[PDB]
Every structure is written in structure tokens, then in C-alpha cells.
Design an enzyme around this catalytic site. Sequence first.
Site, PDB file in Angstrom:
ATOM      1  N   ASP A 154      -0.780   1.039  -6.448  1.00 32.79           N
ATOM      2  CA  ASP A 154      -0.064   1.548  -5.280  1.00 32.79           C
ATOM      3  C   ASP A 154       0.221   3.028  -5.510  1.00 32.79           C
ATOM      4  O   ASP A 154       1.027   3.384  -6.380  1.00 32.79           O
ATOM      5  CB  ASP A 154       1.252   0.784  -5.111  1.00 32.79           C
ATOM      6  CG  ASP A 154       1.938   1.048  -3.770  1.00 32.79           C
ATOM      7  OD1 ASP A 154       1.746   2.133  -3.176  1.00 32.79           O
ATOM      8  OD2 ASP A 154       2.693   0.158  -3.323  1.00 32.79           O
ATOM      9  N   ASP A 183       1.217   5.839   2.364  1.00 28.09           N
ATOM     10  CA  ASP A 183       1.643   4.822   1.410  1.00 28.09           C
ATOM     11  C   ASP A 183       0.618   3.714   1.588  1.00 28.09           C
ATOM     12  O   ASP A 183       0.649   2.998   2.575  1.00 28.09           O
ATOM     13  CB  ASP A 183       3.036   4.327   1.785  1.00 28.09           C
ATOM     14  CG  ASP A 183       3.656   3.463   0.722  1.00 28.09           C
ATOM     15  OD1 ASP A 183       4.826   3.084   0.901  1.00 28.09           O
ATOM     16  OD2 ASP A 183       2.994   3.166  -0.285  1.00 28.09           O
ATOM     17  N   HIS A 222       8.195  -0.714   5.732  1.00 31.30           N
ATOM     18  CA  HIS A 222       9.238   0.217   6.127  1.00 31.30           C
ATOM     19  C   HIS A 222       8.710   1.354   6.988  1.00 31.30           C
ATOM     20  O   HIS A 222       7.510   1.647   6.981  1.00 31.30           O
ATOM     21  CB  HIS A 222       9.837   0.807   4.859  1.00 31.30           C
ATOM     22  CG  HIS A 222       8.803   1.386   3.945  1.00 31.30           C
ATOM     23  ND1 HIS A 222       8.382   2.698   4.029  1.00 31.30           N
ATOM     24  CD2 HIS A 222       8.040   0.809   2.984  1.00 31.30           C
ATOM     25  CE1 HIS A 222       7.407   2.902   3.162  1.00 31.30           C
ATOM     26  NE2 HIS A 222       7.179   1.771   2.516  1.00 31.30           N
ATOM     27  N   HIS A 241      11.067   6.001   2.816  1.00 34.37           N
ATOM     28  CA  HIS A 241      11.767   4.911   3.494  1.00 34.37           C
ATOM     29  C   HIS A 241      12.716   5.529   4.515  1.00 34.37           C
ATOM     30  O   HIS A 241      13.857   5.857   4.194  1.00 34.37           O
ATOM     31  CB  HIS A 241      12.567   4.086   2.479  1.00 34.37           C
ATOM     32  CG  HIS A 241      11.767   3.655   1.290  1.00 34.37           C
ATOM     33  ND1 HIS A 241      10.643   2.864   1.393  1.00 34.37           N
ATOM     34  CD2 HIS A 241      11.924   3.916  -0.029  1.00 34.37           C
ATOM     35  CE1 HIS A 241      10.143   2.654   0.187  1.00 34.37           C
ATOM     36  NE2 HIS A 241      10.901   3.280  -0.693  1.00 34.37           N
ATOM     37  N   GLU A 260       3.197  -3.484   4.369  1.00 36.78           N
ATOM     38  CA  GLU A 260       2.822  -4.038   3.074  1.00 36.78           C
ATOM     39  C   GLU A 260       3.356  -5.438   2.870  1.00 36.78           C
ATOM     40  O   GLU A 260       4.461  -5.761   3.301  1.00 36.78           O
ATOM     41  CB  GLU A 260       3.320  -3.130   1.942  1.00 36.78           C
ATOM     42  CG  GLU A 260       4.833  -2.941   1.875  1.00 36.78           C
ATOM     43  CD  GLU A 260       5.249  -1.841   0.904  1.00 36.78           C
ATOM     44  OE1 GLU A 260       5.986  -0.929   1.331  1.00 36.78           O
ATOM     45  OE2 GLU A 260       4.842  -1.885  -0.284  1.00 36.78           O
ATOM     46  N   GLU A 291      -1.434  -2.793   1.213  1.00 38.37           N
ATOM     47  CA  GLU A 291      -0.596  -1.947   2.047  1.00 38.37           C
ATOM     48  C   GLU A 291      -1.376  -0.853   2.768  1.00 38.37           C
ATOM     49  O   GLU A 291      -2.328  -0.298   2.232  1.00 38.37           O
ATOM     50  CB  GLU A 291       0.483  -1.297   1.169  1.00 38.37           C
ATOM     51  CG  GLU A 291       1.397  -0.298   1.878  1.00 38.37           C
ATOM     52  CD  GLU A 291       2.453   0.297   0.941  1.00 38.37           C
ATOM     53  OE1 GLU A 291       3.506   0.757   1.427  1.00 38.37           O
ATOM     54  OE2 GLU A 291       2.222   0.305  -0.289  1.00 38.37           O
TER      55      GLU A 291
HETATM   56  C1  LIG Z   1      10.626   3.883  -5.413  1.00 39.82           C
HETATM   57  C2  LIG Z   1      10.136   4.912  -4.409  1.00 39.82           C
HETATM   58  S1  LIG Z   1       8.352   4.760  -4.172  1.00 39.82           S
HETATM   59  C3  LIG Z   1       8.379   3.871  -2.727  1.00 39.82           C
HETATM   60  C4  LIG Z   1       7.782   2.537  -3.146  1.00 39.82           C
HETATM   61  C5  LIG Z   1       6.657   2.248  -2.171  1.00 39.82           C
HETATM   62  N1  LIG Z   1       5.398   2.928  -2.438  1.00 39.82           N
HETATM   63  C6  LIG Z   1       6.464   0.681  -1.925  1.00 39.82           C
HETATM   64  O1  LIG Z   1       5.226   0.418  -1.230  1.00 39.82           O
HETATM   65  C7  LIG Z   1       7.566   0.303  -1.057  1.00 39.82           C
HETATM   66  O2  LIG Z   1       7.450   1.334  -0.433  1.00 39.82           O
HETATM   67  N2  LIG Z   1       8.005  -0.682  -1.837  1.00 39.82           N
HETATM   68  C8  LIG Z   1       9.076  -1.327  -1.167  1.00 39.82           C
HETATM   69  C9  LIG Z   1       9.251  -2.771  -1.636  1.00 39.82           C
HETATM   70  C10 LIG Z   1      10.463  -0.533  -1.315  1.00 39.82           C
HETATM   71  C11 LIG Z   1      10.883   0.115  -2.651  1.00 39.82           C
HETATM   72  C12 LIG Z   1      12.179   0.828  -2.802  1.00 39.82           C
HETATM   73  C13 LIG Z   1      13.125   0.941  -1.689  1.00 39.82           C
HETATM   74  C14 LIG Z   1      12.798   0.361  -0.391  1.00 39.82           C
HETATM   75  C15 LIG Z   1      13.760   0.499   0.704  1.00 39.82           C
HETATM   76  C16 LIG Z   1      13.478  -0.075   2.043  1.00 39.82           C
HETATM   77  C17 LIG Z   1      12.206  -0.805   2.297  1.00 39.82           C
HETATM   78  C18 LIG Z   1      11.197  -0.974   1.226  1.00 39.82           C
HETATM   79  C19 LIG Z   1      11.445  -0.406  -0.153  1.00 39.82           C
HETATM   80 MN   LIG Z   2       5.578   1.152   0.830  1.00 36.10          MN
HETATM   81 MN   LIG Z   3       3.293   1.579  -1.656  1.00 37.30          MN
END
Ligand SMILES: CCSCC[C@@H](N)[C@H](O)C(=O)N[C@@H](C)c1cccc2ccccc12
Ligand SMILES: [Mn+2]
Ligand SMILES: [Mn+2]
Length: 369
Positions: free
Chosen positions: A142, A153, A222, A230, A255, A350
Site C-alpha cells: 500500500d 491512495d 475514506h 483522511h 479500500e 484499494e
Molecule cells: C497512517 C496514515 S497513512 C493512511 C493509511 C492509508 N494509506 C490506508 O489505506 C487507510 O488509509 N487505512 C485506513 C484503515 C485508515 C488508517 C488511519 C486512520 C484512518 C482514519 C479514518 C478512515 C481510515 C483510516
Molecule cells: Mn486508504
Molecule cells: Mn492505502
Amino acid sequence: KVQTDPPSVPICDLYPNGVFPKGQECEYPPTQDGRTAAWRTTSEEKKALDQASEEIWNDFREAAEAHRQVRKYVMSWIKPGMTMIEICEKLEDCSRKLIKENGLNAGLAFPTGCSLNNCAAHYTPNAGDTTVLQYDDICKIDFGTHISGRIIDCAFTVTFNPKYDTLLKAVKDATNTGIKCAGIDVRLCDVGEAIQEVMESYEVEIDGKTYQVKPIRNLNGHSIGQYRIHAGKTVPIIKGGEATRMEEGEVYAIETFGSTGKGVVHDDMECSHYMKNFDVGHVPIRLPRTKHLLNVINENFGTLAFCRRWLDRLGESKYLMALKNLCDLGIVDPYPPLCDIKGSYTAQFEHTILLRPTCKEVVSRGDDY
Ligand SMILES: CCSCC[C@@H](N)[C@H](O)C(=O)N[C@@H](C)c1cccc2ccccc12
Ligand SMILES: [Mn+2]
Ligand SMILES: [Mn+2]
């Protein structure tokens, strides 16, 4: 004008006119009433709005093309035997080159996730990590790219043992289902309901045992904002609810994660991912080391996610306490690896989609997935 075998030519140079290839353009899904959405394809009103943000759609496209070329390259050489560090560094080197990194104007949106097996996300090696990729590993690659804060993303799963094939198909189908269901005025809870229904329609057999694929319930998609991975809205993965509908002009990361375990993740292993709280404003700091690290973070990453390895390459050393200080102050937020039960297997797919006025564009879609 033509990319070299091992990708080295910036995407920006492969398209002199500054106009990049669009992703998969789709007509918005009809409503339960049966109402079509073809009218948007060319409704002067919407058409005007759309072209108005062409430079923005274009930035996403340049980042998406970089993402496609980088991942195609990675899929050609990633093999068991390589350390996780060798993999992430080889991928990131290529990504920085194709995105033509330029500080906060162009670069990597977040660390290269390469989560293994029961660990579904947020794992990227820290300095000294001797972990080696194995033949039976199920690795979630990822990674992200961005142009002027317009983030792509996008992620896929890597395996070498065909025993995980139906598991991967299950998650891939679930994500595509979410992408198909997404659209203007669509309720977020319906998207999650749809995703889960498809995901759970899959049964898989791995090493003599059968399982009904489960979506990882506390993980989700998101909305995406400028320099803000996010933006505020979450896309379920199971029957949920949220409290809102998708809106015109919004950008989303669709995703899904599937698991043979409990279908729930928990913090585990050493943390590598970190990201400044988007909502925290300027905070004066006198502590020497802590002050310097925060300046380094603001200069190089801003509100984008980063990892320890990215601090190492900037020549920073003995920064752990300073980093812990920033986290304890709530200025930076830690994002440790998320893993399901021991022995379980997880997969992920994703894509980033643009809810444009005239249509829905799966901007990161490729010939691979
Ligand atoms: C840690 C910052 S990199 C963003 C991670 C991203 N590349 C991944 O794909 C997604 O974006 N993962 C989800 C599960 C997620 C991670 C951390 C906080 C979140 C807050 C709201 C919604 C999803 C969130
Ligand atoms: Mn993501
Ligand atoms: Mn991601």
C-alpha cells in the site's frame, strides 16, 4: 517521451502538454428508483463545473500514472528472499523519480506499507529490521503518490503460493463492488453493506482448512482532501451507518480488507508510521531536539504521513524521544501495525476515485487491477 525498462523517466516528461491520461470513467449508478445518471455525461451545468477543476483532476492523474508505473515495476521483481527494507527502498526510489519529487509540491503521500500475513496494515520496516519475505507470505503493498497535495491512495496484495488465490479474488471483488456502488448521493452505509455481502459470498480453502472470508470491521475507506489523506468521512466495509452520503466533488479511497481470522485488527509490533494531526495549529517549542524534529516534519512532510526510515534518510539520528514527545503532545499521531489473530491471513485492494460532476473516475485503475 518513452519510459525506460527500469522506470526512470518522470511522468511529467512523458506528457509534455501537462495533460495526463484519465482513469476509468464510469456513469454514476442508478438510484433504487431506477433513475439513470447518464444526464451528467453532458449536462452543460455539470460539464462546466467539471472542466473548472480540470487542473485538479489532472494532478491526481499524474500521481495515478506514476502509481501505475511504479507498481507494475514492483510486481516484476518482488520475490521471496528480499528483505522488507530492500523492497520498500527499491519501490520508493522509483516512486520518487516518476513523481519527480519536489518537496511538498510532489512526492510520496505516505510510507510504503508491506504488511505481512495476519498483519493487515501500517507495517513498513524501521532501520535494522531483518525481516525477509517468504514464499508463503501474503504481503499488502500500500503506497501513495501526490502532486500538489492531490493524493492517490492505492494498494494491492502480493503472494507466491496459489493457495491464497480465492482470498485475493474475494477482496478484489469486494473493493470493485464498493467502487461500483460509490457515487453522488449514495449513503456510506449502503456501500459498506454491499462490500460485505460480496466479500462474505466467498469461501476459501487454505492448507486443508476452510473459511468464509470476513471483512476487517474496524478498517475502512475514506474521503481524501488536499494534503489530508483522511478528510473526515469513512467508508465502512460492513453493515455500519456512519451518518452521511457521498457528495459531488469529493474524492474517496475505496479500500477493503479480508481476513481468515477474527475480522478485527489491533495494534501490534513496533510503530513506523506517524502523521501530524491535521487540526493542530502552530505550537511553540523550546525543547531543542523536539523543536528541530517538528521543524523537519513541517518542512518535509507537512500534514502527510511519514515513517522513521524517512527521518533516517534526512540525516536525522537519536530522534525517538523527540518523536515520542510530539506524539505525547498530540502534535503528531502514531499509527502502529494493525494485525488480526496469530495464524490468520489478510488481504487488501484499494483505489482512489473522483466524484466528478459529469462522472465517477476510478483514477488509479490500471491494466493490473
Ligand atoms: C497512517 C496514515 S497513512 C493512511 C493509511 C492509508 N494509506 C490506508 O489505506 C487507510 O488509509 N487505512 C485506513 C484503515 C485508515 C488508517 C488511519 C486512520 C484512518 C482514519 C479514518 C478512515 C481510515 C483510516
Ligand atoms: Mn486508504
Ligand atoms: Mn492505502
